[PDB]
Every structure is written in C-alpha cells, then in structure tokens.
Design a protein around this nucleic acid. Structure first.
Length: 153
RNA sequence: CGAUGCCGACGCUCAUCAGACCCCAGAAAAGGUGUUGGUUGAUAUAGACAGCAGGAUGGUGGCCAUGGAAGUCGGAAUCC
C-alpha cells in the first residue's frame, strides 16, 4: 500500500526532539531508523530544513528529497556551517550568481507549476529578498534590469 | 408682586437628576448613531452606501527562531 507522507527534516544534522513517532509508529517501521536513513540520504545539505516526501509500503519506506525555492537559494549560498550553539544574527550576506537563479528557474519549470520563464525568474528573485540576499543590488534594481534587457530564452 | 394681558422676531432644547441671571451657594476628566450646526477628505452610471450570496489561492510548510509554531504565539522582513 502506497502512502505518501511529508516530513520537514532538519537536514544532515540529527535532531534531538523528533516528530516521527506519531506519523510512522502505527505503520510499523522504526522512526529512529527512518530518521537515520533521512539523515544519510540528505548528505550534502547539512544545514537546512527540507520537506522530504516518504513513500511508505508495507515492507519498507523510500525517501524522495523535494527542494524548495528558498532551500535552493540557501543551498546556492555557500557559507561555512556553524555548531549547535547557533550564534545570533546569522542572516545571510553575500551575492547570488544569476546563472544559479537561471538553474533554479529551469528546475522550477521542470516541476512545472508557474508562468513561463519570465515569471519564474521574477518570482524566484522575489523569494531571494525574502531569504535576504541581493545580486549586486536588490529587487527594484532587477526590475529595471528586466525592462528591455531581459535574458529569457 | 407694581409692570409685556406685545397678535413680539429668529433659532436651540425633552431631561426616568431638565434649566432658570456678578459675588452666590455647587461640579470635573472621559464619553453619546439624542438632536442641531460647521471643518476636512473620499466615490458615484468607468454604476457607489447598506442588504442577501461565491471565491479568498500559487512561489512557500518564507528565511533567524522554539520541545512545537506550517499567514492566524514574538522580532527583522513584508515582493512576483
């Protein structure tokens, strides 16, 4: 029996207080083993929370990582990760490559719930300032850059 | 209690605590869709104000965060 469930995991870091026993417990498979398998299957994220889908059968489950738009933005932003102490004001400072935004727009077009590419670049660059970074200037600069100088295929 | 017993003029006020003339014998801040005026800004045939009903969604379960907070506890943010 196919059962699709959503789990917002903390990434490669193993969380102490889990939220796996009420959802997976009555199905049968061990939630500690589920958390260990998700922490092994993430691997390269190591910092962020990802809404991973799990397709559970009668025998065992399968893990499918679904990256969000903000998840891809903070994945593209490469900072050194810190410890469990988590020092305050860890808000992101840097510069996002525009080709990375093009790649995220192509992946969101492959997921295919949007307008065509001109809309996807605008909405992902609008989520970029909600993440809190800028491509050599903020969103009103890229609004001016979109006018008569677009780079849409 | 002498004198409006003016064919007086115009408005305001209803008080289930009305009000009625310097000192002086009583009243405040805060309120009222009670009613009478004034100041300013709106929208209305590109169809307003009430009135009876339908949607109120995607990027996203946004990033710091907390045992947990997925728009509906805080603070930065607050765009397509």
């Amino acid at each position: 029996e196919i059962k699709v469930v959503y789990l917002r995991c903390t990434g490669g870091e193993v969380g102490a207080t889990s939220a796996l026993a009420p959802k997976i417990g009555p199905l049968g498979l061990s939630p500690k083993k589920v958390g260990d398998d998700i922490a092994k299957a993430t691997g390269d994220w190591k910092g962020l929370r990802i809404t991973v889908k799990l397709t559970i059968q009668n025998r065992q489950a399968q893990i499918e990582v679904v990256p969000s738009a903000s998840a891809l933005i903070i994945k593209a932003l490469k900072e050194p990760p810190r410890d469990r102490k988590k020092q305050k004001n860890i808000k992101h400072s840097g510069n996002i490559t525009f080709d990375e935004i093009v790649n995220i727009a192509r992946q969101m077009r492959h997921r295919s719930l949007a307008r065509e590419l001109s809309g996807t670049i605008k909405e992902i660059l609008g989520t970029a300032q909600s993440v809190g970074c800028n491509v050599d200037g903020r969103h009103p600069h890229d609004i001016i850059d979109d006018i008569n100088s677009g780079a849409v295929e």
